[PDB]
Design an enzyme around this catalytic site. Sequence first.
Site, PDB file in Angstrom:
ATOM      1  N   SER A 219      -1.966  -5.711   7.665  1.00  0.00           N
ATOM      2  CA  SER A 219      -0.751  -4.995   7.434  1.00  0.00           C
ATOM      3  C   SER A 219       0.032  -3.350   8.419  1.00  0.00           C
ATOM      4  CB  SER A 219      -0.439  -4.998   6.638  1.00  0.00           C
ATOM      5  OG  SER A 219       1.250  -4.810   5.705  1.00  0.00           O
ATOM      6  N   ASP A 242      -2.831 -10.024   9.292  1.00  0.00           N
ATOM      7  CA  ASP A 242      -1.026  -9.711   9.010  1.00  0.00           C
ATOM      8  C   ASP A 242      -0.594  -8.414   8.856  1.00  0.00           C
ATOM      9  OD1 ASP A 242       0.413 -12.157   8.601  1.00  0.00           O
ATOM     10  OD2 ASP A 242       0.496 -11.426   6.175  1.00  0.00           O
ATOM     11  N   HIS A 297       1.483 -12.568   2.513  1.00  0.00           N
ATOM     12  CA  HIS A 297       0.805 -11.384   2.869  1.00  0.00           C
ATOM     13  C   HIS A 297      -0.175 -10.400   2.007  1.00  0.00           C
ATOM     14  CE1 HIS A 297       1.295  -7.860   5.743  1.00  0.00           C
ATOM     15  NE2 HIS A 297       1.962  -7.116   4.556  1.00  0.00           N
TER      16      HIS A 297
HETATM   17  C1  LIG Z   1       4.499  -4.363   5.782  1.00  0.00           C
HETATM   18  C2  LIG Z   1       4.171  -3.402   4.426  1.00  0.00           C
HETATM   19  C3  LIG Z   1       5.478  -2.804   4.716  1.00  0.00           C
HETATM   20  C4  LIG Z   1       6.281  -1.596   5.337  1.00  0.00           C
HETATM   21  C5  LIG Z   1       7.094  -0.869   5.071  1.00  0.00           C
HETATM   22  C6  LIG Z   1       7.476  -1.023   3.890  1.00  0.00           C
HETATM   23  C7  LIG Z   1       6.396  -1.615   2.570  1.00  0.00           C
HETATM   24  C8  LIG Z   1       5.542  -2.542   3.686  1.00  0.00           C
HETATM   25  C9  LIG Z   1       3.242  -2.494   5.436  1.00  0.00           C
HETATM   26  C10 LIG Z   1       2.037  -2.660   4.715  1.00  0.00           C
HETATM   27  O1  LIG Z   1       0.845  -2.269   5.303  1.00  0.00           O
HETATM   28  N1  LIG Z   1       1.734  -3.568   3.897  1.00  0.00           N
HETATM   29  C11 LIG Z   1       0.872  -3.721   2.952  1.00  0.00           C
HETATM   30  C12 LIG Z   1       0.870  -3.281   1.987  1.00  0.00           C
HETATM   31  O2  LIG Z   1      -0.271  -3.949   1.361  1.00  0.00           O
HETATM   32  C13 LIG Z   1      -0.450  -3.144  -0.037  1.00  0.00           C
HETATM   33  C14 LIG Z   1       0.139  -2.744  -0.385  1.00  0.00           C
HETATM   34  C15 LIG Z   1      -0.156  -1.841  -2.045  1.00  0.00           C
HETATM   35  C16 LIG Z   1      -1.492  -2.538  -2.291  1.00  0.00           C
HETATM   36  F1  LIG Z   1      -2.140  -2.572  -3.375  1.00  0.00           F
HETATM   37  C17 LIG Z   1      -1.855  -3.780  -2.127  1.00  0.00           C
HETATM   38  C18 LIG Z   1      -3.530  -4.260  -2.191  1.00  0.00           C
HETATM   39  N2  LIG Z   1      -4.665  -5.436  -3.451  1.00  0.00           N
HETATM   40  C19 LIG Z   1      -1.545  -4.288  -0.830  1.00  0.00           C
HETATM   41  C20 LIG Z   1       3.281  -4.433   3.102  1.00  0.00           C
END
Ligand SMILES: C[C@]1(c2ccccc2)CC(=O)N(CCOc2ccc(F)c(C#N)c2)C1
Length: 371
Positions: A219, A242, A297
């Site tokens: 991400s 992703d 995701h």
């Molecule tokens: C698109 C993102 C996003 C962008 C802006 C606002 C909100 C979200 C960016 C990103 O890196 N994302 C992945 C976060 O994956 C996580 C998070 C916390 C966790 F505990 C775990 C686990 N296991 C995985 C979401």
Amino acid sequence: KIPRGNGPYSVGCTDLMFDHTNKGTFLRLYYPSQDNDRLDTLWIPNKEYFWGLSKFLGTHWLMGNILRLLFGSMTTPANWNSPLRPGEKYPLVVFSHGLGAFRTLYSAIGIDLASHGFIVAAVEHRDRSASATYYFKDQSAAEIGDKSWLYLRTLKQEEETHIRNEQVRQRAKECSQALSLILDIDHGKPVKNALDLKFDMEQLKDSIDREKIAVIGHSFGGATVIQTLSEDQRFRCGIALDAWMFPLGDEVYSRIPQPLFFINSEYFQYPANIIKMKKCYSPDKERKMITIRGSVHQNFADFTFATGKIIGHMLKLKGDIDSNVAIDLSNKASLAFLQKHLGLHKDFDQWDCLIEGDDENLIPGTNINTT
Ligand SMILES: C[C@]1(c2ccccc2)CC(=O)N(CCOc2ccc(F)c(C#N)c2)C1
Ligand SMILES: [Cl-]
């Protein structure tokens, strides 16, 4: 339960912080281990990570202690502080976590890589993109173990473009710094770990295959892959899991000479994001893309294993596809790619067909239409 690695090597795990400051490197290391009778590794090791996650989830702060109750005793199947398996030089992956994550939450990936004979360094970013992280204010504070915690930053609409880009650039710098730290450790420089752990870093001397280096991330970590490649030619290829492309500056898209592999989920992706991935493409460059059928995701992170099927599906941690099935596909396809582009002499080429998305649970390229 987080699955064990599928490769022949037993897996070890430890933490490394050097220097002790907020500008130092903090990473969790997964590596092929000599021993298999050690205690398993505590998955989320400090309460403050739960406190951080509670802010990221936008929940009541008191939910942190509930998350800790629920998940604070969970382990991941890596032998804590096991000696390194000697007698062979291992390629190196530097791993970058997503937003609101931190170094320990991609152990399914890291353990699997290790079990196939990689050393994996999962960075903990100090850009305020982690739910939480820590360091020491000065030399004294690190001795007595007086931790300073840094929590996730919430951005206003008007900071989003600018601050996400500053963050991805810091992340790239932290990846390059981690590489340099590990390469120095390989070339035998004494490093006093700021964490007092029973694991002598001298073990790592002459144990890295110094040119066989890749960067992987999920991400925000996937954008980090791409920034990192453009900045540091020491990394010989990248795998973006992703990728969230928004953080990248317009300038980076034409500046990635190394092979790059996009492994996407079916349900996360969208035209704006895919268009950005396609701006990395160029006739002279090596690019591959696949999409895991029925995946979300979260299939690339450890919390897809932390709960049951039903609450997992409800909380968007699990997709239609089985989480072990999904991660097996991502990990095996990753191995084949790494073999191809690092020039490894292993048997990972058995999974070559998965790079082309030639499998009943894979889609070649992308399901997302862009026009
Ligand atoms: C698109 C993102 C996003 C962008 C802006 C606002 C909100 C979200 C960016 C990103 O890196 N994302 C992945 C976060 O994956 C996580 C998070 C916390 C966790 F505990 C775990 C686990 N296991 C995985 C979401
Ligand atoms: Cl869109």
